[PDB]
């Protein structure tokens, strides 16, 4: 809704006595529901998302080191110790170095040396938990009335659903109401998945894969980075010093490792790039407006000429300049002579309530050459169409 | 030199009439050259390096995008154009998007859409060319004379070589001649020095040129193949999501884990190679062979201690002696004065008074006695060697 602009479009035709109609809604794709003597219903999946998901883990992929301290005792008497050894935010290594005369050591052999460095994570990846019962989804619904595209945003009724929400009613003024009985299909394995977000970008990843990452990781409460050694390298000691270096930024390797996973985008709410919604649509309470109106006989004008939609249909915008509340006769014939409709009207029973009103018509013409005829008499509009 | 402090130590003993002695020097490793009736020569490889190598390539491994511009025409109305399409520093894509009445074009079909973005490299890797004719190497040479460790840097002669033989004169001890050749692991014509921030490597040219990353030259600053770090997601209506790919520092470094390392002076030093040397020992003379024997009292400034080389070192002070030589032996008994030990510091010496002299001896296995001096003034130290 509106399904004319959305290129991936399916038509579902209801049977005359049908009360319910099955329809599955996919992302970037919409469905047009038709039923005899009833207005056409455009349905579409807008978003499937999660609100306020809980953090379970953080995984650092870029770390910086500060406050690098070194203690370098001599052989025999002396275990080396640094105060930074008993602090939580320090990556430390305890080793022994070859020392003797020349390094200020009265004996030749191994001297204890400890190197500690402040571990502070520059950039980390957030791992949120996904709950099925916290999933909400949004569906656009809009009836096929003669409305301008610039009025679509006024007509579209947007519906919000929860994980276990029930059938939802949508009433269109002067057209009755429809009922949507929808069910959400995740495409995710909650008991085995995380939301992994780096800076701006997010994914649906395997929990096992995330926990098996060889990178430092944190928790939801205490802020002490665990397994810091993954991003901190201690080179072999020379005399009384140790080269302590932080490893490279792991953004790239991670992202390349994430190329095939289901995508997620967080915006001012976590949108899911997948999934779909199974819906049962009640059409019986949907009524056609102005079936008893008189016929428009006044001069009409194509504000917008019949044009191809790519859906195998044609659309046009007709202005009714003088004609009062009246209905518009639109048919697609094989000739100017026979008044036999070979085309199918998607915008069922067109109407012009007020004057100078612009009304949008969509028709499914037959294959080949045809005539789009709108109105009667000398006032009627005819437009040549070819559809191989 | 001095090879005592360097734990990885080899001994090379020359034959009596030998004029030349072969020796191979590896990184962080030294050799002690001995020869009968001649002073011991400590040789070591300090550095093998390159001076001012020429930059040849750059390879961006982190890029940032700014100035994201987009131009979007409707179907059947023209190709979309941006001013930034013609600038050198912009990554651009031209595509077509699904359009119609839904986005405000009066026809349904493909509308031209172009997206450009300012490409600026945050962090890049420099690829220098390695010219073997710019390779220099440094060798420490130092004789085993009776000195203290704190005087070693004063005694040590440091030598520089490029891609002939160099003479090293020790005052009062003659001179040695080093005919050295440097062997490094480089296919100069098939290698780069690859430097990122602080760390550098010796990399293979093919690998460097085959990297799926944007690359530049030493001259003009126009980044080529910018698409390697820039992704244009499929167009929706009138926009395109333009993303810069992730920092490639980690993947690059992990791909480089096994390669030969390179560093800088705080002059690109190589973490490898070795030097093959021919050492001339004939012109080396021993000092103070005719000095009298120290008969006055001596004292251990530093007691005999294990070096880890199977040898022992000690520091002896001569306070009340004149220019004199010190008799050092290692016997298996205090009565028998028969030396079973090998003197590394050949013919110890005391030029001035209160002089402290370092003795290094290679004692025999088992129980032994280190004897310094004669008479009642002599120092004895029981030593055990497994």
């Amino acid at each position, epitope marked *: 809704a509106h399904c004319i602009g959305i290129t991936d479009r399916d038509f579902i035709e209801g049977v005359h006595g049908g009360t319910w109609v099955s329809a599955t809604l996919e992302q970037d794709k919409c469905v047009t529901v038709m039923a005899p003597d009833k207005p056409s219903l455009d349905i579409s999946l807008e978003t499937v998302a999660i609100d306020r998901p809980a953090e379970v883990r953080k995984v650092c992929y870029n770390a910086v080191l*500060t*406050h*690098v*301290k*070194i*203690n*370098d*005792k*001599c052989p025999s008497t*002396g275990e*080396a*110790h640094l*105060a*930074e050894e008993n*602090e939580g935010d320090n990556a430390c290594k305890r080793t022994y170095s070859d*020392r003797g005369w020349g*390094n*200020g*050591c*009265g004996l030749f052999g191994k*001297g204890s040396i400890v190197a500690c460095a*402040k571990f502070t994570c520059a950039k980390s990846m957030s791992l949120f938990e996904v709950d099925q019962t916290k999933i909400q989804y949004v569906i656009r619904a809009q009836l096929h009335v003669g409305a301008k595209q610039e009025n679509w945003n006024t007509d579209i009724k947007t519906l919000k659903f929860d994980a276990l929400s029930g059938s939802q009613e949508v009433e269109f003024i002067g057209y009755g109401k429809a009922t949507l009985e929808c069910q959400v299909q995740t495409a995710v394995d909650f008991g085995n998945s995380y939301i992994a977000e780096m800076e701006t970008e997010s994914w649906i990843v395997d929990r096992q894969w995330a926990q098996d990452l060889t990178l430092p990781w944190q928790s939801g409460s205490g802020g002490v980075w665990r397994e810091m050694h993954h991003l901190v390298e201690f080179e072999p000691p020379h*005399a*009384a*010093t*140790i*080269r*302590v270096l932080a490893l490279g930024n792991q953004e790239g390797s991670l992202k390349t490792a994430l190329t095939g996973a289901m995508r997620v985008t967080k915006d001012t709410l976590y949108k899911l790039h997948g999934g779909h919604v199974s819906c049962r649509v009640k059409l019986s309470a949907l009524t056609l407006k102005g079936t008893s109106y008189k016929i428009c006989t006044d001069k009409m004008f194509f504000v917008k000429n019949p044009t191809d939609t790519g859906h195998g249909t044609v659309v046009m915008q007709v202005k009714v300049s003088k004609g009062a509340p009246c209905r518009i006769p639109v048919i697609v014939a094989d000739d100017l002579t026979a008044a036999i409709n070979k085309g199918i009207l998607v915008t069922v029973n067109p109407i012009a309530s007020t004057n100078d009103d612009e009304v949008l018509i969509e028709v499914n013409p037959p294959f080949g050459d045809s005539y789009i005829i709108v109105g009667r008499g000398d006032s009627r509009l005819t437009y040549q169409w070819h559809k191989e | 030199a001095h090879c005592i402090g360097i734990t990885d130590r080899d001994f090379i003993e020359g034959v009596h009439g030998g004029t030349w002695v072969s020796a191979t020097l590896e990184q962080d490793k030294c050799v002690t050259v001995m020869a009968p009736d001649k002073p011991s020569l400590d040789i070591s490889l300090e550095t093998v390096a390159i001076d001012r190598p020429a930059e040849v390539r750059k390879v961006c491994y982190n890029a940032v995008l700014t100035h994201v511009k987009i131009n979007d025409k409707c179907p059947s109305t023209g190709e979309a154009h941006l001013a930034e399409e013609n600038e050198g520093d912009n990554a651009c894509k031209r595509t077509y998007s699904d359009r119609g009445w839904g986005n405000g074009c009066g026809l349904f079909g493909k509308g031209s859409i172009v997206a450009c973005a300012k490409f600026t490299c945050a962090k890049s890797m420099s690829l220098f060319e390695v010219d073997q004719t710019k390779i220099q190497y440094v060798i420490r040479a130092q004789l085993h004379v009776g000195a203290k460790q*704190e005087n070693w*840097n004063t005694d040590i002669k440091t030598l520089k070589f490029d891609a002939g033989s160099q003479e090293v004169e020790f005052i009062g001890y003659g001179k040695a001649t080093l005919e050295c050749q440097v062997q490094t692991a480089v296919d100069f014509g098939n290698s780069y020095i690859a430097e990122m921030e602080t760390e550098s490597w010796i990399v293979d040219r093919q690998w460097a040129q085959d990297l799926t990353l944007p690359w530049q030259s030493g001259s003009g600053g126009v980044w080529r193949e910018m698409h390697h770090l820039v992704e244009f997601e499929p167009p929706h209506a009138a926009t395109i999501r333009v993303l810069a790919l992730g920092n490639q520092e980690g993947s690059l470094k992990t791909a480089l884990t096994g390669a030969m390392r390179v560093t800088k002076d705080t002059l690109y030093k190589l973490h490898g190679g070795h030097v093959s040397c021919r050492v001339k020992l004939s012109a080396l003379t021993l000092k103070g062979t005719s000095y009298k024997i120290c008969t006055d009292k001596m004292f251990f400034v*530093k007691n005999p201690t294990d070096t880890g080389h199977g040898t022992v070192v000690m520091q002896v002070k001569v306070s009340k002696g004149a220019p004199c030589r010190i008799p050092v032996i290692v016997a298996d008994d205090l009565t028998a004065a028969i030396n079973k030990g090998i003197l590394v510091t050949v013919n110890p010496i005391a030029s001035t008074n209160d002089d402290e002299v370092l003795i290094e001896v290679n004692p025999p296995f088992g129980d032994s006695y280190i004897i310094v001096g004669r008479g009642d003034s002599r120092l004895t130290y029981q030593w055990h060697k497994e």
Partner: antibody
Framework: EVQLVESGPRLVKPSETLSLTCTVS????????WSWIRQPPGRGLEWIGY???????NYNPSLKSRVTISLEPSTTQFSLKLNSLTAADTAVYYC?????????????????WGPGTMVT | QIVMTQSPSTLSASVGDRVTITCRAS??????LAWYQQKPGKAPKLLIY???SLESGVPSRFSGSGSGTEFTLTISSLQPEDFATYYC?????????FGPGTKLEIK
């Protein structure tokens, strides 16, 4: 836990020399710059000077002509010797470690101090 | 020898206050500046190094800023511990120079 203790003659008559010694425990003296700093009663701190294991040393210009700082590496202790004393030299003398890491490029200035010793 | 000045000479304040001490070098010293806290009869303790970096484990209420000539030490919320004399010191190049000190006492 790197600790420094300075010791030596407490009461010094004028015109003599000052023999102070700082003893280093918990760490060797191969690294860092070992320094002396003094503080007269009721005034501010005056940086006297330093010496390293390398042999490189440096003294305060107002004191350079008199000050001699030496290093005994074996016992890991270093000594201050100030000549041509005066009433101005009456101060609390601290020995301190200037931490210098030339491998990872970290410098914390004087990070470890001794109790300080009062010379008159 | 580079000359260091401090301002103010003395500051009286109460517990819970925000205080800011200033330190000036005769010439640019980059960021190589240290802050020391000295209590009567005791040795100076290292608080800040490299202008802004805190020594572990100095309370996070302590902070430093500045580079070149101008420097400031800041205590966001004063405590009974903090009442002592604060000295600044340049260690960009020898000879090193301490400041005259800023005395901080209770009102």
């Amino acid at each position: 836990e790197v600790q420094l203790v300075e010791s030596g003659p407490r009461l010094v008559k004028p015109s003599e020399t000052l023999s102070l010694t700082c003893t280093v425990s918990g760490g060797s003296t191969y690294n860092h710059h070992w320094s002396w700093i003094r503080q007269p009663p009721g005034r501010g701190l005056e940086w006297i000077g330093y010496i390293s294991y390398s042999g490189k040393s440096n003294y305060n210009p107002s004191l350079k002509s008199r000050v001699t700082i030496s290093l005994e590496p074996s016992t890991t202790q270093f000594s201050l010797k100030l000549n041509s004393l005066t009433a101005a030299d009456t101060a609390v003398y601290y020995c301190a470690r200037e931490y210098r890491d030339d491998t990872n490029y970290y410098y914390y200035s004087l990070d470890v101090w001794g109790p300080g010793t009062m010379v008159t | 020898q580079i000359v260091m000045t401090q301002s103010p000479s003395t500051l009286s304040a109460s517990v819970g206050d925000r205080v800011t001490i200033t330190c000036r070098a005769s010439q640019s010293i980059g960021s190589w500046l240290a802050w020391y806290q000295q209590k009567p009869g005791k040795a100076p303790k290292l608080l800040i190094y490299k202008a802004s970096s805190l020594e572990s484990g100095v309370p996070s209420r302590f902070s430093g800023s500045g580079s070149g000539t101008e420097f400031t030490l800041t205590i966001s919320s004063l405590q009974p511990e903090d009442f002592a004399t604060y000295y600044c010191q340049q260690y960009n190049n020898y000879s090193y120079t301490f400041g005259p000190g800023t005395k901080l006492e209770i009102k």
